[PDB]
Design a protein around this ligand. Structure first.
Ligand SMILES: [Cl-]
Ligand SMILES: [Cl-]
Ligand SMILES: [Cl-]
Length: 158
């Protein structure tokens, strides 16, 4: 199964963390990276005093179950990132989001795939489109059609 994972970091100096997270994704059992998007830079949500966000998409080949993949992505978040004391129960300094898991629709207490809001997020769709321009969502909507119709601005490269 090809899973598509969104990497987000809000560290002032995120490259070391992001590269560590990429290596860690590869170390996941029964899984390996197929490709990684360019790194993209987007404005911090709210006040602009905060560093830019680093955004990227990863194609991960895997034979794990979706929940098993989630276990590992959560572990990597714990090991490579930290709580943001400004929003403790929100995203950590490193966020790994499972955007898509093959053509599967998954709804559980701990996991919703496709990611519940990704179709509204240029910062998730653009890096995904770079590595998977022909992508079709489980409901049959085309990634390319969403980007074109919604007219999201392109992102700046890191
Ligand atoms: Cl920078
Ligand atoms: Cl911490
Ligand atoms: Cl869908």
């Amino acid at each position: 199964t090809v899973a598509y994972i969104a990497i987000g970091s809000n560290l002032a100096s995120p490259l070391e963390q992001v590269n560590a997270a990429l290596k860690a994704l590869g170390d996941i059992p029964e899984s390996h990276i197929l490709t990684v998007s360019s790194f993209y830079r987007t404005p911090p949500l709210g006040p602009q005093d905060q560093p830019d966000y680093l955004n990227a998409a990863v194609a991960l080949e895997t034979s794990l179950a979706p929940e098993e993949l989630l276990n590992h992505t959560q572990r990597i978040e714990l090991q490579q990132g930290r709580v943001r004391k400004a929003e403790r129960w929100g995203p950590r300094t490193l966020d790994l989001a499972i955007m898509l898991f093959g053509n599967e629709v998954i709804n559980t207490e701990r996991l919703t795939v496709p990611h519940y809001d990704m179709k509204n997020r240029g910062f998730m769709l653009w890096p995904l489109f770079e590595i998977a321009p022909e992508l079709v969502f489980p409901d049959g909507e085309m990634l390319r059609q969403i980007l074109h119709t919604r007219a999201f601005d392109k992102l700046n490269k890191w």
